[PDB]
Write a protein that binds this ligand. Structure first.
Ligand SMILES: *[C@@H]1O[C@H](CO)[C@@H](O)[C@H](O)[C@H]1NC(C)=O
Ligand SMILES: *[C@@H]1O[C@H](CO)[C@@H](O)[C@H](O)[C@H]1NC(C)=O
Ligand SMILES: *[C@@H]1O[C@H](CO)[C@@H](O)[C@H](O)[C@H]1NC(C)=O
Ligand SMILES: *[C@@H]1O[C@H](CO)[C@@H](O)[C@H](O)[C@H]1NC(C)=O
Ligand SMILES: *[C@@H]1O[C@H](CO)[C@@H](O)[C@H](O)[C@H]1NC(C)=O
Ligand SMILES: *[C@@H]1O[C@H](CO)[C@@H](O)[C@H](O)[C@H]1NC(C)=O
Lengths: 240, 299, 49, 50
């Protein structure tokens, strides 16, 4: 039931992919934090099974709602548990059940038989308001110490063929205590049915880095400095 | 000295004392499923230990004492008497049946067959261990063989690592090749429990509780009753485990919907939100200072 | 500038653990008992001195 | 009491001997004996109660 052929590309990420490290309020201060971030002027992939590594930064700008949910798993088999995030019009479904995934899963639109064959043993289920809501949607996924953390941001963007230049802090969405091993992730698509369609997105990987963030008197992050980008930024970090 | 010359001297210091105490805890009315963890009538083997996670409920430890006159109740990171007021993020429970004399092997920094091949605890463990006799429950007159323990393993076990592989162990250069011949042994040994066995071999049910501190806004705390809120007075406060003293006043600080605390340049807490009613309050230290004595000569 | 920097450093030094479980005395007092609190308290005392 | 010197020391036969009840090293780590260098080795062997 394969229908999608993927073409790779490359571009510059610029200064994108900044999120709030912790839930502590600060104002009119400069704070140094060592954590997993997307490096400044990194070299991300444009797409028209992908490794997970230590975290994933996802970017999209498409309105046709072809993008909905993701699949996270090591072997993508019924032998091991896997995360399946599905966003629809009304709510969101999150399960950690050992689904028997097909080679090219996609929503039929709404039978799940093509996505997976069977449902089986599992312990976690979550339902809430759907994550999704000229528009740019950015997401950050990271699985650490028995917790899957998802951050996001939605911004209005003018007609541009690349990621914009500016600062936008990603606010926390969810922290699910799953505690399972994650190696690969796949993007879900919803084709009406078998009509042909096209979709594109940006994928980047996170690395451990030290950042210097600037807080304003309203407590919103407005500027960031990557200490390892160049000697000037190293001097700025040293002088704080 | 018994004589003082003319001048000013710094003698001591003073501080305004607190008036009362203010206690605020969340409004969750659920009861944590500690009951289902115990008295389950079926406990898994030590080599395959069940792991359960408890969150979003009020944790009461009275049923622990109401259960039985426990053989062993040992807490390492905390004090057993003060679990009634602490607040945790997540709770982990591991339950299994073990032999009587091996109970001492379950502790941080301990070696032994159960310690290295069955169940290993981290050196920074922060929790409690409970062990009680269950001879009348898990001892058949002829012998119960449902409980098994691993005996042989090539390498040691990392903390909180579970192994369920069942393959014929090879103790020499030659491979077993699917048969349990000479120098090839099964990795699992089955316990034998009979009522005629004395102390040190009868089965014991063991539950290990692990607590998670210093994480996202904690949820597992509701035993102690909350109180009202007072302002503009030197008072002691306890907000979801954050204990302190000072003066609470109204705040004009714009908290986004996901912050809980507030810090400054000196990295000290200055703002907090009430769990029961979402409202930002500023905290100021109570008055303190020094006292000087002015006197002429004693002559 | 020197006076402000010295005062800021002295204030910021209070957040160190000096090889202890925590840097807050209230947390140690509300989570433990006398017999095992002195071991944690001594390192903080030495560092602050 | 036996003394060992002037030879290549291999500890594989130690593991090939038997599934030992107790193997405890104090001054060093058991996994790194394959690369260390010593001056003299002393061995004391006897039978004791369990
Ligand atoms: C990004 O990576 C590709 C191949 O990995 C490389 O050809 C390209 O020069 C890099 N940079 C940009 C801006 O595409
Ligand atoms: C969307 O997902 C929610 C979550 O279970 C479900 O209740 C609802 O029926 C779904 N909507 C449709 C149209 O299937
Ligand atoms: C799910 O896991 C349990 C636990 O081992 C197992 O007994 C069962 O066969 C698995 N599959 C299904 C469909 O329940
Ligand atoms: C996850 O997958 C990796 C590689 O497939 C494996 O080594 C690991 O044991 C698995 N589980 C965990 C908890 O990492
Ligand atoms: C900062 O907060 C003040 C007070 O609400 C507001 O008037 C001002 O517009 C804010 N500045 C921003 C959001 O840049
Ligand atoms: C557990 O179950 C037994 C019966 O199976 C019951 O007598 C007891 O009250 C229950 N609760 C506790 C805490 O033992």
């Amino acid at each position: 039931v394969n229908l999608i052929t993927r073409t790779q590309s490359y571009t510059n990420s610029f200064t994108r992919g900044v999120y709030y490290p912790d839930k502590v309020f600060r104002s009119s201060v400069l704070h140094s934090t060592q954590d997993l971030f997307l490096p400044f002027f990194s070299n991300v992939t444009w797409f028209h099974a992908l490794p997970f590594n230590d975290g994933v930064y996802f970017a999209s700008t498409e309105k046709s709602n072809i993008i909905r949910g993701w699949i996270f798993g090591t072997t993508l088999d019924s032998k091991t548990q896997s995360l399946l995030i599905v966003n629809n019009a009304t709510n969101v479904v999150i399960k950690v059940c050992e689904f028997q995934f097909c080679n090219d899963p996609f929503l039929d639109v709404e039978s799940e038989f093509r996505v997976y064959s069977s449902a089986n043993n599992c312990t976690f289920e979550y339902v809430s308001q759907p994550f999704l809501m000229k528009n740019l949607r950015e997401f950050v996924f990271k699985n650490i110490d028995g917790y899957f953390k998802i951050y996001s941001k939605h911004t209005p963007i003018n007609l541009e063929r690349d990621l914009p230049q500016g600062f936008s802090a990603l606010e926390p969405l969810v922290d699910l205590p799953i505690g399972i091993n994650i190696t690969r992730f796949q993007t879900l698509l919803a084709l009406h049915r078998w009509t042909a369609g096209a979709a594109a997105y940006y994928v980047g990987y996170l690395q451990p880095r030290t950042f210097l963030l600037k807080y304003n008197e309203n407590g919103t992050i407005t500027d960031a400095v990557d200490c390892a980008l160049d000697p000037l930024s190293e001097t700025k970090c040293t002088l704080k | 000295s018994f004589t003082v010359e003319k001048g000013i001297y710094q003698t001591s210091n003073f501080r305004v004392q607190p008036t009362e105490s203010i206690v605020r805890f969340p409004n969750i009315t659920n009861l944590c499923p500690f009951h289902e963890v115990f008295n389950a009538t079926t406990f898994a083997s030590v080599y395959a230990w069940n792991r359960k996670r408890i969150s979003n409920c009020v944790a009461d430890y009275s049923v622990i004492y109401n259960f039985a006159p426990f053989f062993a109740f040992k807490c390492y990171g905390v004090s057993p008497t003060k679990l009634n007021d602490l607040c945790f993020t997540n709770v982990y429970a591991d339950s299994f049946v073990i032999r009587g004399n091996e109970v001492s092997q379950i502790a941080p920094g301990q070696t032994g067959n159960i310690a290295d091949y069955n169940y290993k605890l981290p050196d920074d463990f922060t929790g409690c261990v409970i062990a009680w006799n269950s001879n009348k429950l898990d001892s058949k007159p002829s012998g119960n063989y449902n409980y098994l323990y691993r005996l042989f393993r090539k390498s040691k076990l990392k903390p909180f690592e579970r192994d369920i592989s069942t393959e014929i162990y090879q103790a020499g250069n030659k491979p077993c090749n699917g048969v349990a011949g000479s120098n090839c042994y099964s990795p699992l040994q089955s316990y034998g429990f009979r009522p005629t066995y004395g102390v040190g071999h009868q089965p014991y049910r063991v539950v290990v509780l692990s607590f998670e501190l210093l994480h996202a806004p904690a949820t597992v705390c509701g035993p102690k009753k909350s109180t009202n809120l007072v302002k503009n007075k030197c008072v002691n406060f306890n907000f979801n485990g954050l204990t302190g003293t000072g003066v609470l006043t109204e705040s004009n600080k714009k908290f986004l919907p996901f912050q809980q605390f507030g810090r400054d340049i000196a990295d000290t807490t200055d703002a907090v939100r009430d769990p029961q009613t979402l409202e930002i309050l500023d905290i100021t230290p109570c008055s303190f200072g020094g006292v000087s004595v002015i006197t002429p000569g004693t002559n | 500038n020197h006076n402000a920097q010295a005062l800021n450093t002295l204030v910021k030094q209070l957040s160190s653990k000096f090889g202890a479980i925590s840097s807050v005395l209230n947390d140690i007092l509300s989570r433990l008992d006398p017999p095992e609190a002195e071991v944690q308290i001594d390192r903080l005392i030495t560092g602050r001195l």
